[PDB]
Amino acid sequence: MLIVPYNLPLPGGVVPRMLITILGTVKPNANRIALDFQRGNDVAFHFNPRFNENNRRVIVCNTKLDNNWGREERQSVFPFESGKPFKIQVLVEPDHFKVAVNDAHLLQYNHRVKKLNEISKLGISGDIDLTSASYTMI
Ligand SMILES: COc1cccc(C(=O)N[C@H]2[C@@H](O)[C@@H](CO)O[C@@H](S[C@@H]3O[C@H](CO)[C@H](O)[C@H](NC(=O)c4cccc(OC)c4)[C@H]3O)[C@@H]2O)c1
């Protein structure tokens, strides 16, 4: 019931101890999901579940700088299921983003973009019904 793509402002950027929670349901014949933590036009952290990349399910993570994608980091563990409700938690830690899905740790992504306080937007897109997007400090 939120409109997708959805932009969640992150006022003053991110900081260690900030927890971002996304609740939604994957659409039945989903192809992709994306979370894009942005620093202006750059994408500090792109989190991209792909449901059918050569008939395999994979999560691709990357950074986009000056319109150029970098080296992908790929994860073979794939917790999403078409048609099913999910929870994504992204905890900012000093050295990484730490991602858990459905309360199970999934992956960490080392900070490539250093100016955490300038990562001031989260875009949420793809083949989901989005229920809520929020943040809190733990
Ligand atoms: C679809 O709707 C939208 C909507 C809005 C935005 C976007 C968006 O910008 N998505 C891009 C983003 O996800 C980006 C992330 O890197 O990937 C690219 S695809 C990428 O293309 C690269 C060549 O240019 C290579 O082929 C690369 N593969 C590897 O590096 C590789 C590595 C190891 C192992 C391996 O094993 C198979 C493969 C491919 O992932 C997406 O197009 C798409």
UniProtKB/Swiss-Prot annotation:
Q: Give TM regions.
A: none
Predominantly, its location class is: cytoplasm
Q: Name one GO biological process term.
A: neutrophil chemotaxis
A GO cellular component annotation here is: secretory granule membrane
Tissue distribution: A major expression is found in the colonic epithelium. It is also abundant in the activated macrophages. Expressed in fetal membranes.
Q: Which residues form the Galectin domain?
A: 6-136
Keyword annotations for this protein, in alphabetical order, are:
Acetylation, Cytoplasm, Differentiation, Disulfide bond, IgE-binding protein, Immunity, Innate immunity, Lectin, mRNA processing, mRNA splicing, Nucleus, Phosphoprotein, Repeat, Secreted, Spliceosome
Q: Which parts of the sequence carry Phosphoserine?
A: S76
The entry's a beta-D-galactoside-binding residues are W69, G70, R71, E72, E73, R74, Q75
Q: What does this protein do?
A: Galactose-specific lectin which binds IgE. May mediate with the alpha-3, beta-1 integrin the stimulation by CSPG4 of endothelial cells migration. Together with DMBT1, required for terminal differentiation of columnar epithelial cells during early embryogenesis. In the nucleus: acts as a pre-mRNA splicing factor. Involved in acute inflammatory responses including neutrophil activation and adhesion, chemoattraction of monocytes macrophages, opsonization of apoptotic neutrophils, and activation of mast cells.
Protein name per Swiss-Prot or TrEMBL:
Galectin-3
Give the organism, scientific name.
Homo sapiens (Human)
Coding gene? LGALS3
